[PDB]
Amino acid sequence: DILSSIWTEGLLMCLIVSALLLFILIVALSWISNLDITYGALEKSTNPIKK
Amino acid sequence: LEQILWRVLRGNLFFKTVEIEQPVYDVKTREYKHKNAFIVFSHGDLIIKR
Amino acid sequence: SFSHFLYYLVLIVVIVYGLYKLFTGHGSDINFGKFLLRTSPYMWANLGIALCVGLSVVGAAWGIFITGSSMIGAGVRAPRITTKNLISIIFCEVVAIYGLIIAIVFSSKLTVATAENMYSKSNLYTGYSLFWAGITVGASNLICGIAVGITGATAAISDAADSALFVKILVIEIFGSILGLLGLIVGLLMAGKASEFQ
Amino acid sequence: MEGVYFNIDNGFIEGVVRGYRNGLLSNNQYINLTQCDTLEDLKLQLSSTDYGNFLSSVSSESLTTSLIQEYASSKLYHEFNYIRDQSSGSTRKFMDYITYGYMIDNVALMITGTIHDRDKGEILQRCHPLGWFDTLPTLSVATDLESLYETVLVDTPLAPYFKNCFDTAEELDDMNIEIIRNKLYKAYLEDFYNFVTEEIPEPAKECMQTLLGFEADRRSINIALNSLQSSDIDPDLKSDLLPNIGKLYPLATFHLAQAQDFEGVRAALANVYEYRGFLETGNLEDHFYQLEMELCRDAFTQQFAISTVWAWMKSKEQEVRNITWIAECIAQNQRERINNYISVY
Amino acid sequence: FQRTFVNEIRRLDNVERQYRYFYSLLKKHDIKLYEGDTDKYLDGSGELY
Amino acid sequence: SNIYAPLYAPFFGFAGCAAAMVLSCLGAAIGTAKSGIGIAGIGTFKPELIMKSLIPVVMSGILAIYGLVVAVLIAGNLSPTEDYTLFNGFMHLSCGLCVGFACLSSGYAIGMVGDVGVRKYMHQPRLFVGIVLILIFSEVLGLYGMIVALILNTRGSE
Amino acid sequence: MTELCPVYAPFFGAIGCASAIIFTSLGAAYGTAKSGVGICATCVLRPDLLFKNIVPVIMAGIIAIYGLVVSVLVCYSLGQKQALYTGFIQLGAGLSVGLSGLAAGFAIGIVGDAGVRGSSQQPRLFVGMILILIFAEVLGLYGLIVALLLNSRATQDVVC
Amino acid sequence: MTELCPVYAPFFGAIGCASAIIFTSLGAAYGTAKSGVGICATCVLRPDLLFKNIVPVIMAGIIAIYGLVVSVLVCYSLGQKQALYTGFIQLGAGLSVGLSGLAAGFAIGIVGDAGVRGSSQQPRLFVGMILILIFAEVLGLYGLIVALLLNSRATQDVVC
Amino acid sequence: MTELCPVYAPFFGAIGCASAIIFTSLGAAYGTAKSGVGICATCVLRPDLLFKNIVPVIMAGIIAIYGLVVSVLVCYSLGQKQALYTGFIQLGAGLSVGLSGLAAGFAIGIVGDAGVRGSSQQPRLFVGMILILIFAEVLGLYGLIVALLLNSRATQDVVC
């Protein structure tokens, strides 16, 4: 009276754990992709109008 | 400068640039800056003036 | 958008697979019930404990940076707020302590079950109990931590304007902090009758 | 909701900017300022406020209303550039979009100031510093829109906005520049409004759409009134100067375009509630500044919204106008108008 | 601006501005400002001078 | 063994218990957070109005109590020593979904109304009685969820 | 036990019972929320109008009554040994009032917001808003009628 | 095979061991990057603050140390024939510190990014930054504590 | 087949071997690209700084070498009849160095780009950039350390 000859309880446990870890990884990379450098502070800009 | 002049002269630009090896001092700005010597060739009076 | 295309594709695949098994008469194969009986109870317990502290910490961290960034920004003109508003950071950090405490309590139940007793009534009950109890404490602390953090940002930016506003707005903050404590209480109730893995 | 993600980048900006808002002069401080005897007293009184020591380097006999305006404005611009420099991403785009309006005015000032023969040395001192771009003084080279476009303006962020300017005459005068100046503003606001609609989150989106809407309406009414000085103009030409994003659009803008006298314009506005009182009574100029401040004051009640940058800018700009008006009355010893500073806070 | 010793302060404020200006020139030409003895008057001692 | 009480039944009972408490907190969290922004928004302009306008926050807090009551009642019925039937498992699952999403929906409305309510109450002092009246209609949405949750729990164990 | 009455049959009924309240509550909340913004915005200038133009909130609130009424009716019809057919009917009844009530809520929210704002400018418009809201309201009533008809057949002529 | 020791049991140990260092590395990298830009943005005008302001990078580094410590500890308990109970203990230990450290690294980054900028304009504000930043760091420590607790039970009286 | 050595066991070995080099190469590519733009954008005015600004590229390059070492190490351990346990350990080692190296790649890329731009304005900032980069570089080293530990344990006491 098995669950399946292919989708055994052993395989499903591995997959849903993998799905959880992959979801956390994707969310992590989704935040990292949004790191924008604050260019304005790093590059000098000048004009003759200011003091 | 050369970007602007290229359009003004319709691509007939003959243009040379040479470095000055050390900063030049701009006392009114109280800073010193690098500079380049440059030269541009043309014959037309109105073109020279522009 | 690619992500929403993926969601619909998964949904369509699931529906078509379900209908295929159903129409061919083998609809009883999917059998979620058997899946819950055959999966080892240690998985449910450990996911409950790990996500309990995990989601609780995410809550505290998410709240802290919302309040902390506001305190530092508002503090440039008025440094006096930096020490008085540390209370707001505390209300964020504490929900991690609640998650930690539950992790201590639940850890006491992870004994080793005898093989002949592995899937018995009591052991399955403890497996389900610690999973949902851990999720409940974790998620509610995650929600609580963010809500407190958002409130703390408005409190800090108000304090920089007029000191009399701070005590008035902190009332909203303690109201927010109660959510995490109620989560803890329900967590201890759900896990109350669960026996150790026999 | 808004607060969950806003602070990942904008938390520091929002905190500092509201620090500035807490420094806006209150009505009580204005009242005190109006009772100074001399400019040297005004400096001492201002030193009590958030302005602090900003005039500490100026000699007693150097104090003049023009200089106070320059120093008070320079304080604002440095604070603006600091806030911009500490920003990134969509916020950086938003703050740059704020600058475009000023450099559009600089372009028109630069051209008109050289159609009449006076050298760039004077004009650059009259320019608004937030509107600087490195090729700006090169616009003194020529007196022809085609030449000015192909040689300079193509490189500027303003390039997309000239789509309707080249149809004009081959020769430039004050009237023709004023047509160009308004045609640019039309495309600028319509472009700015779209960027806000697309890439700015709530509640800033709704708030910012309101602020730009009022800005478009103010231009529309001013354009209509100014056109009445001309003998005649094609209504289908006027319609190209009115921006499309405002509250007056499309109904009132259509009637404004076809108006030929003050009563026509007054009738055109009478069907729009929010402005129904503007032309019937009092000074029109002050009414707009009154409504502008109230819209800014409303915007500050939001939080976790980048619109506070716009509210702070336009609010403190009005503060400089208040300071200089009071300073002029003090310097000229005539005070019957001194209480006409306009302030919500 | 109405406190009674305002004008006396203005004189000394103006001198303070000028001393700031002098110190700027010392730094422009890179000349070391000389150091006075911190204890030549008093150190919290209450000593009359 | 009783076929109506398979050993996996408690899973759905706990799932309902978790849904009851978590979603109720989400509703309460949104209601107080949105209201807090409104309360703080007027702070610099009219400090007097705060203490007499925390009503949205207090009402938003009641939503958490609705969740607590249902979660407590469910947790009181689950036990390892009783033949907790599968029918009871589904009933307690619906108990969580009802009170959970009812409180979540109510919390969202209380937040939206509360924010603009107090945030414009500073312009018009006669507005307040209207704000309270609208909030009550926003509040009862959560109450309806609790009513059905209590009825489901009453029938499930009998 | 019997094939017509699987032990999992109550699941569909239980989901239908919850569905009736989930979606109606979302409809009522959205209708209340966006109507409230309209009421609060207008009453600054026209506070005397408040109790007249509050009507949309009442209309949105009634949608939740529909969900409660259907939810209780199916709830009193659930049972440990109910047939599978009874489960499907209850699921259909729950979805019918649920998602139809959600549609009504969105309509009331949009119409109420615009109608209240307009009514502050033009008193003739109020009766117009009420008529349009009646048509929005009736979309909820149709869903209820179907739900009640379905529920009436949930146990008629059934055999275990 | 043995019912308590299925052949796939080591997977949860191996992936948990990897997860402990992977998730903490991503958290530490984000903290190092976001605050590192802030240090560059300020030091161009105030270079003397450089070595004073570097603390946020230091604290972000500690989060990775926690990940390395847990990863080493669980790694020393892997084995081919290990029980399934041991496997999920190792997964819980690795996931606990991993998910915890990931959040702590992000918070250190966002607070540190603001902190060093504020330090430039208001000298009293440096200590304020440090106080807040510790309570981001400790959130990684709580993850370590739970990991150590679970790991302590990995081999206690477990029998194949 | 002997259940401790299923036919599919080397699949995790192969993916572990490939993962070690793939993910680190993505990290090294991002570090080289993001910092490369900064170098070019600054050196047009300051060519004299070119060979001092190169360091961020070198460090980003080293990240790739970590993955090459691990990939070669696990590569020599694959086999037709390897144990499943050996497969999981090889997978864990590959992911450990791979995704940890990817995290380090992002950090070096961001701080490298910001660092060289700032270093053009303020020469005292270069030491600060190098100091921060080392903390980012070390994250990849932790990934290598875990990977080597796992690999050392991948083939002891196995009973294939």
Coordinates of N, CA, C and O in Angstrom, one line a residue, chain G residues 46-151:
Chain G
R46 N -18.0 70.6 3.3 CA -19.5 70.4 3.4 C -19.8 69.5 4.5 O -20.4 68.4 4.2
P47 N -19.5 69.8 5.7 CA -19.8 68.9 6.8 C -21.3 68.6 7.1 O -21.6 67.5 7.5
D48 N -22.2 69.5 6.7 CA -23.6 69.3 6.9 C -24.1 68.2 6.0 O -25.2 67.7 6.3
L49 N -23.4 67.8 5.0 CA -23.8 66.8 4.1 C -23.5 65.4 4.5 O -23.9 64.4 3.8
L50 N -22.8 65.2 5.6 CA -22.2 63.9 5.9 C -23.2 62.8 6.0 O -23.1 61.8 5.3
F51 N -24.2 62.9 6.8 CA -25.2 61.9 7.1 C -26.1 61.6 5.9 O -26.8 60.6 5.9
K52 N -26.1 62.5 4.9 CA -26.8 62.2 3.6 C -26.0 61.3 2.7 O -26.5 60.4 2.1
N53 N -24.7 61.7 2.5 CA -23.9 61.0 1.5 C -23.1 59.8 2.1 O -22.3 59.2 1.4
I54 N -23.4 59.4 3.4 CA -22.8 58.2 4.0 C -23.4 56.9 3.4 O -22.9 55.9 3.6
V55 N -24.5 57.1 2.6 CA -25.3 55.9 2.2 C -24.4 54.8 1.6 O -24.7 53.6 1.9
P56 N -23.5 55.1 0.7 CA -22.7 54.0 0.1 C -22.1 53.1 1.1 O -22.0 51.9 0.8
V57 N -21.7 53.6 2.3 CA -21.2 52.7 3.3 C -22.2 51.7 3.8 O -21.9 50.5 4.0
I58 N -23.5 52.1 3.9 CA -24.6 51.2 4.2 C -24.7 50.1 3.1 O -24.8 48.9 3.4
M59 N -24.7 50.6 1.9 CA -24.8 49.6 0.8 C -23.7 48.6 0.8 O -23.9 47.4 0.6
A60 N -22.5 49.0 1.0 CA -21.3 48.1 1.1 C -21.5 47.1 2.3 O -21.2 46.0 2.2
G61 N -22.0 47.7 3.4 CA -22.2 46.8 4.6 C -23.2 45.7 4.4 O -23.0 44.6 4.9
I62 N -24.2 45.9 3.6 CA -25.3 44.9 3.5 C -24.7 43.7 2.7 O -25.2 42.6 2.9
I63 N -23.7 43.9 1.9 CA -23.1 42.8 1.2 C -22.6 41.7 2.2 O -22.7 40.5 2.0
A64 N -22.1 42.2 3.3 CA -21.6 41.2 4.4 C -22.7 40.4 5.0 O -22.6 39.3 5.4
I65 N -23.9 41.0 5.0 CA -25.1 40.3 5.6 C -25.4 39.1 4.7 O -25.7 38.0 5.1
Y66 N -25.4 39.3 3.3 CA -25.6 38.2 2.4 C -24.6 37.0 2.7 O -25.1 35.9 2.8
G67 N -23.3 37.3 2.9 CA -22.4 36.3 3.2 C -22.7 35.6 4.5 O -22.6 34.3 4.6
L68 N -23.0 36.3 5.5 CA -23.4 35.7 6.8 C -24.6 34.8 6.7 O -24.6 33.7 7.2
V69 N -25.6 35.3 6.0 CA -26.9 34.5 5.9 C -26.6 33.2 5.2 O -27.1 32.1 5.7
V70 N -25.9 33.2 4.1 CA -25.6 31.9 3.4 C -24.7 31.1 4.2 O -24.9 29.8 4.3
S71 N -23.7 31.7 4.8 CA -22.7 30.9 5.6 C -23.4 30.1 6.7 O -23.1 28.9 6.9
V72 N -24.3 30.8 7.4 CA -25.0 30.1 8.5 C -25.9 29.0 8.0 O -26.0 27.9 8.6
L73 N -26.6 29.2 6.8 CA -27.5 28.3 6.3 C -26.8 27.0 5.9 O -27.3 25.9 6.3
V74 N -25.7 27.1 5.2 CA -24.9 25.9 4.9 C -24.3 25.3 6.2 O -24.2 24.0 6.3
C75 N -23.9 26.1 7.1 CA -23.3 25.6 8.3 C -24.2 24.7 9.1 O -23.7 23.7 9.6
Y76 N -25.4 25.1 9.2 CA -26.4 24.2 9.9 C -26.8 23.0 9.1 O -27.5 22.1 9.6
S77 N -26.2 22.9 7.9 CA -26.5 21.7 7.0 C -25.3 20.8 6.9 O -25.5 19.7 6.2
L78 N -24.2 21.1 7.5 CA -23.0 20.2 7.5 C -23.2 19.0 8.4 O -23.9 19.2 9.4
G79 N -22.6 17.9 8.1 CA -22.7 16.7 8.9 C -21.6 15.7 8.7 O -21.0 15.7 7.6
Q80 N -21.4 14.9 9.7 CA -20.2 14.0 9.6 C -20.4 12.9 8.5 O -19.4 12.5 8.0
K81 N -21.7 12.6 8.2 CA -21.9 11.5 7.2 C -22.7 12.0 6.0 O -23.4 11.3 5.3
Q82 N -22.5 13.3 5.6 CA -23.2 13.9 4.5 C -22.7 13.3 3.2 O -21.5 12.9 3.1
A83 N -23.6 13.3 2.2 CA -23.2 12.7 0.9 C -22.3 13.7 0.2 O -22.2 14.9 0.5
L84 N -21.5 13.1 -0.8 CA -20.6 13.9 -1.6 C -21.4 15.0 -2.4 O -20.9 16.1 -2.5
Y85 N -22.5 14.6 -3.0 CA -23.3 15.6 -3.7 C -23.7 16.8 -2.9 O -23.6 17.9 -3.3
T86 N -24.0 16.5 -1.6 CA -24.3 17.7 -0.7 C -23.1 18.6 -0.6 O -23.3 19.8 -0.4
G87 N -21.9 18.0 -0.6 CA -20.7 18.9 -0.5 C -20.6 19.8 -1.7 O -20.3 21.0 -1.5
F88 N -20.7 19.3 -2.9 CA -20.6 20.1 -4.1 C -21.6 21.2 -4.1 O -21.2 22.4 -4.5
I89 N -22.8 20.9 -3.8 CA -23.9 22.0 -3.8 C -23.5 23.1 -2.8 O -23.6 24.3 -3.2
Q90 N -23.1 22.7 -1.6 CA -22.7 23.8 -0.7 C -21.5 24.6 -1.2 O -21.4 25.8 -0.9
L91 N -20.5 23.9 -1.8 CA -19.4 24.6 -2.4 C -19.9 25.6 -3.5 O -19.5 26.8 -3.5
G92 N -20.8 25.2 -4.3 CA -21.4 26.1 -5.3 C -22.1 27.3 -4.7 O -22.0 28.4 -5.2
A93 N -22.9 27.0 -3.7 CA -23.6 28.1 -3.0 C -22.6 29.1 -2.4 O -22.8 30.3 -2.5
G94 N -21.6 28.6 -1.8 CA -20.6 29.5 -1.2 C -19.9 30.3 -2.2 O -19.7 31.6 -2.0
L95 N -19.4 29.7 -3.3 CA -18.8 30.5 -4.3 C -19.8 31.5 -5.0 O -19.4 32.7 -5.3
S96 N -21.0 31.1 -5.1 CA -22.0 32.0 -5.8 C -22.2 33.3 -5.1 O -22.0 34.4 -5.7
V97 N -22.5 33.3 -3.8 CA -22.7 34.5 -3.1 C -21.3 35.2 -2.8 O -21.2 36.4 -2.8
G98 N -20.3 34.4 -2.6 CA -19.0 35.0 -2.3 C -18.4 35.9 -3.4 O -18.3 37.1 -3.2
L99 N -18.1 35.3 -4.6 CA -17.5 36.0 -5.7 C -18.5 37.0 -6.3 O -18.0 38.0 -6.9
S100 N -19.8 36.7 -6.3 CA -20.7 37.7 -6.8 C -20.8 38.9 -5.8 O -20.9 40.0 -6.3
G101 N -20.7 38.6 -4.5 CA -20.6 39.7 -3.6 C -19.4 40.6 -3.7 O -19.4 41.8 -3.5
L102 N -18.3 39.9 -4.1 CA -17.0 40.6 -4.3 C -17.2 41.6 -5.5 O -16.7 42.7 -5.5
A103 N -17.9 41.1 -6.6 CA -18.1 42.0 -7.7 C -18.9 43.2 -7.3 O -18.7 44.3 -7.7
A104 N -20.0 43.0 -6.5 CA -20.8 44.1 -6.1 C -20.0 45.1 -5.2 O -20.2 46.3 -5.4
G105 N -19.1 44.6 -4.4 CA -18.3 45.5 -3.5 C -17.5 46.4 -4.3 O -17.4 47.6 -4.0
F106 N -16.8 45.9 -5.4 CA -16.0 46.7 -6.2 C -16.8 47.8 -6.9 O -16.4 49.0 -7.0
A107 N -18.0 47.4 -7.4 CA -18.8 48.4 -8.1 C -19.3 49.5 -7.1 O -19.2 50.7 -7.4
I108 N -19.7 49.1 -5.9 CA -20.1 50.1 -4.9 C -19.0 51.0 -4.5 O -19.1 52.2 -4.3
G109 N -17.7 50.5 -4.4 CA -16.6 51.3 -4.1 C -16.3 52.4 -5.1 O -16.2 53.6 -4.7
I110 N -16.3 52.0 -6.4 CA -16.0 53.0 -7.4 C -17.1 54.0 -7.5 O -16.9 55.2 -7.6
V111 N -18.3 53.5 -7.6 CA -19.5 54.4 -7.8 C -19.6 55.4 -6.6 O -19.8 56.6 -6.8
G112 N -19.5 54.8 -5.4 CA -19.7 55.6 -4.2 C -18.7 56.7 -4.1 O -19.0 57.9 -3.8
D113 N -17.4 56.4 -4.4 CA -16.3 57.4 -4.4 C -16.6 58.5 -5.3 O -16.6 59.7 -4.9
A114 N -16.9 58.2 -6.6 CA -17.2 59.3 -7.5 C -18.5 60.0 -7.2 O -18.6 61.2 -7.3
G115 N -19.5 59.3 -6.9 CA -20.8 59.9 -6.6 C -20.8 60.8 -5.4 O -21.4 61.9 -5.5
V116 N -20.1 60.4 -4.3 CA -20.1 61.3 -3.2 C -19.3 62.6 -3.5 O -19.8 63.7 -3.1
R117 N -18.2 62.5 -4.2 CA -17.4 63.7 -4.5 C -18.2 64.6 -5.4 O -18.3 65.8 -5.2
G118 N -18.9 64.0 -6.4 CA -19.8 64.8 -7.3 C -20.9 65.5 -6.6 O -21.2 66.6 -6.8
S119 N -21.6 64.7 -5.7 CA -22.7 65.2 -5.0 C -22.4 66.5 -4.2 O -23.3 67.3 -4.0
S120 N -21.2 66.7 -3.7 CA -20.8 67.9 -3.0 C -20.9 69.1 -3.9 O -21.1 70.2 -3.4
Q121 N -20.7 68.9 -5.2 CA -20.7 70.1 -6.1 C -22.1 70.3 -6.7 O -22.4 71.5 -7.1
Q122 N -23.0 69.3 -6.8 CA -24.2 69.4 -7.5 C -25.3 68.6 -6.8 O -25.3 67.4 -6.9
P123 N -26.2 69.3 -6.0 CA -27.2 68.5 -5.3 C -28.1 67.7 -6.1 O -28.7 66.7 -5.6
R124 N -28.3 68.1 -7.4 CA -29.2 67.3 -8.2 C -28.7 65.9 -8.5 O -29.5 65.0 -8.9
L125 N -27.4 65.7 -8.2 CA -26.8 64.4 -8.6 C -27.0 63.3 -7.6 O -26.8 62.1 -7.9
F126 N -27.5 63.6 -6.4 CA -27.6 62.6 -5.3 C -28.5 61.5 -5.7 O -28.1 60.3 -5.6
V127 N -29.7 61.8 -6.2 CA -30.6 60.7 -6.7 C -30.0 59.9 -7.8 O -30.3 58.7 -7.9
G128 N -29.1 60.5 -8.6 CA -28.4 59.7 -9.6 C -27.5 58.7 -9.0 O -27.5 57.5 -9.4
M129 N -26.8 59.1 -7.9 CA -25.9 58.1 -7.3 C -26.7 57.0 -6.7 O -26.2 55.8 -6.8
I130 N -27.8 57.3 -6.1 CA -28.6 56.2 -5.4 C -29.1 55.2 -6.5 O -29.0 54.0 -6.2
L131 N -29.5 55.7 -7.6 CA -30.0 54.7 -8.6 C -28.9 53.8 -9.1 O -29.1 52.6 -9.3
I132 N -27.7 54.4 -9.4 CA -26.6 53.6 -9.9 C -26.1 52.6 -8.8 O -25.7 51.5 -9.1
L133 N -26.2 53.0 -7.5 CA -25.8 52.1 -6.5 C -26.8 51.0 -6.3 O -26.4 49.9 -6.0
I134 N -28.1 51.3 -6.6 CA -29.1 50.2 -6.5 C -28.8 49.1 -7.5 O -28.9 47.9 -7.3
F135 N -28.3 49.5 -8.7 CA -28.0 48.6 -9.8 C -26.7 47.8 -9.3 O -26.6 46.6 -9.6
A136 N -25.7 48.5 -8.7 CA -24.6 47.8 -8.2 C -25.0 46.9 -7.0 O -24.5 45.8 -6.9
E137 N -25.9 47.3 -6.2 CA -26.3 46.5 -5.0 C -27.0 45.2 -5.5 O -26.7 44.1 -5.0
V138 N -27.8 45.3 -6.6 CA -28.6 44.1 -7.0 C -27.7 43.0 -7.5 O -28.1 41.8 -7.4
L139 N -26.5 43.3 -7.9 CA -25.6 42.2 -8.3 C -25.3 41.3 -7.2 O -25.1 40.1 -7.4
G140 N -25.2 41.8 -5.9 CA -25.1 40.9 -4.8 C -26.4 40.1 -4.6 O -26.3 38.9 -4.2
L141 N -27.5 40.7 -4.8 CA -28.8 40.0 -4.5 C -29.0 38.8 -5.5 O -29.4 37.8 -5.1
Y142 N -28.6 39.0 -6.7 CA -28.7 37.9 -7.7 C -27.8 36.7 -7.2 O -28.3 35.6 -7.2
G143 N -26.6 37.0 -6.7 CA -25.8 35.9 -6.2 C -26.4 35.2 -5.0 O -26.4 34.0 -4.9
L144 N -27.1 36.0 -4.1 CA -27.7 35.4 -3.0 C -28.9 34.5 -3.4 O -29.1 33.4 -2.9
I145 N -29.7 34.9 -4.4 CA -30.8 34.1 -4.9 C -30.3 32.8 -5.4 O -30.9 31.7 -5.1
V146 N -29.3 32.8 -6.2 CA -28.7 31.5 -6.7 C -28.2 30.7 -5.6 O -28.5 29.5 -5.5
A147 N -27.5 31.3 -4.6 CA -27.0 30.5 -3.5 C -28.1 29.9 -2.7 O -28.0 28.7 -2.3
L148 N -29.2 30.6 -2.4 CA -30.3 30.0 -1.7 C -31.0 28.9 -2.4 O -31.4 27.9 -1.9
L149 N -31.2 29.1 -3.7 CA -31.8 28.0 -4.5 C -30.9 26.8 -4.5 O -31.4 25.6 -4.3
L150 N -29.6 26.9 -4.7 CA -28.7 25.8 -4.6 C -28.8 25.1 -3.2 O -29.0 23.9 -3.2
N151 N -28.8 25.9 -2.2 CA -28.8 25.3 -0.8 C -30.1 24.5 -0.6 O -30.1 23.5 0.1

